[PDB]
Amino acid sequence: SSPIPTQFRSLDSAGKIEILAGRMALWFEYAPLISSLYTDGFTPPTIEELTGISSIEQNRLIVGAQVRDSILQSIHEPELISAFDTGGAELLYEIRLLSTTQRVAAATFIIDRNIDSKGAQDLARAIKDYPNRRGDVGWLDFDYNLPGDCLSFLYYRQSRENKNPSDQRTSMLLQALGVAESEKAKNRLNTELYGDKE
């Protein structure tokens, strides 16, 4: 599944389990030990019983580590990876459905703008959804390649579902503006939010 780190590759199950029970490494370093333990014939409930890693956290760690590994292999800035060393699992898990290229871009955006897990979920969902919205008003003003533009376009779509004028509409438009990256996307947002009634 993932690659087991050198320092751990000659452990029997018991050694892997004791390490996990002590969280005795970086999160993505003990994650492959979980995968490895699965194939030893150990199932998640009994791994939670022995280490305290809930079966949900297990999946999050394994999948996060694979996402991390995607970015690592792909050409990237080295500092990007360094940023996930602590609590990076919950953010990387959320972008797992994206392609490799999208993962590198989304992760970069998550780091630059300090996005939490919820926001990362929204971002990943927005990126994944964008191509399906071709017919929608304003779609051409947002760059699919740009994570913040994808998320911006989702907030903009949601704003067009609210009444105009309303505080809800205004709030969604201001959110769309907070994450927009391209000038074309900011142009449309400015045009529609600040339209010369104001």
UniProtKB/Swiss-Prot annotation:
Provide the transmembrane region boundaries: none
Please list the disulfide bridges: none
The places in or outside the cell where this protein is found are:
Plastid, Chloroplast
Which stretches does the entry tag as region N-terminal alpha-helix? 4-193
> What is written about domains in the entry's comments?
Has 3 domains, the N-terminal alpha-helical domain, an extended flexible linker and the C-terminal beta-sheet domain. The N-terminal alpha-helical domain stabilizes RbcL dimers and RbcL dimer-dimer interactions, facilitating RbcL(8) formation. The C-terminal beta-sheet domain probably dimerizes Raf1. The 2 C-terminal beta-sheet domains are swapped and pack against each other to form the dimer interface.
Which family would the database say this protein is a member of? Belongs to the RAF family.
- Oligomeric and partner information: Homodimer.
Q: What does this protein do?
A: Required for assembly or stability of RuBisCO. Acts at a postchaperonin step to fold and/or assemble the large subunit (rbcL) into RuBisCO. RAF1 brackets an rbcL dimer (rbcL(2)), leading to rbcL(8)-RAF1(4) complex formation. In the next step, RBCS displaces RAF1, thus resulting in holoenzyme formation.
| Name of the protein | Rubisco accumulation factor 1.2, chloroplastic
The record lists the organism as Arabidopsis thaliana (Mouse-ear cress)
Q: What is the lineage of its organism?
A: Eukaryota, Viridiplantae, Streptophyta, Embryophyta, Tracheophyta
